[PDB]
Amino acid sequence: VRSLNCTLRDSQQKSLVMSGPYELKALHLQGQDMEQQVVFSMSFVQGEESNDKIPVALGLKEKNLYLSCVLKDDKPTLQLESVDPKNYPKKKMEKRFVFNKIEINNKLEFESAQFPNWYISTSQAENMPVFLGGGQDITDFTMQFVS
Numbered sequence: 001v002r003s004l005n006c007t008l009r010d011s012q013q014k015s016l017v018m019s020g021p022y023e024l025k026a027l028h029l030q031g032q033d034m035e036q037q038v039v040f041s042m043s044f045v046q047g048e049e050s051n052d053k054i055p056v057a058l059g060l061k062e063k064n065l066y067l068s069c070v071l072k073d074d075k076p077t078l079q080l081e082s083v084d085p086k087n088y089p090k091k092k093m094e095k096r097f098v099f100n101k102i103e104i105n106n107k108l109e110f111e112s113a114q115f116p117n118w119y120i121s122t123s124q125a126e127n128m129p130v131f132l133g134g135g136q137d138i139t140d141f142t143m144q145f146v147s
């Protein structure tokens, strides 16, 4: 499987950092604090594809942790999920790990492949969790490539 290391920033230009072991949060960051941002390994996985819709998995660089979409208290919910480090990443990722990376107006949205029309989202407020949203909440991102 092919993977690229990258960071993400929301359309309000908030960066993403760890919020405990299994959550991410978004906040405005600049300067030395930039080292705190999460670096993703974006893997290009199997799934239905178009020019503007590309299936990816979002793992944390050098960690056996992936973003995943599951029902929690009966609601679609973004979680960080651990995996066996000997088996990942792989080309045929389970559907809960797959996001459709969609380019619209020079920004990216990440739609859950498991839950159509649910998107990786951030709040306008500082220091709040990254979540799966189904308006005020931000669903557009840019990507920064990392060496």
Ligand SMILES: O=C(NCCO)Nc1ccc(Br)cn1
Residues within 6 Å of the ligand: 103, 104, 106, 107, 108, 141, 142, 143, 144, 145
């Ligand atoms: O401009 C970007 N990065 C800033 C320099 O690090 N990224 C970018 C641009 C278009 C789309 Br679509 C997604 N990401």
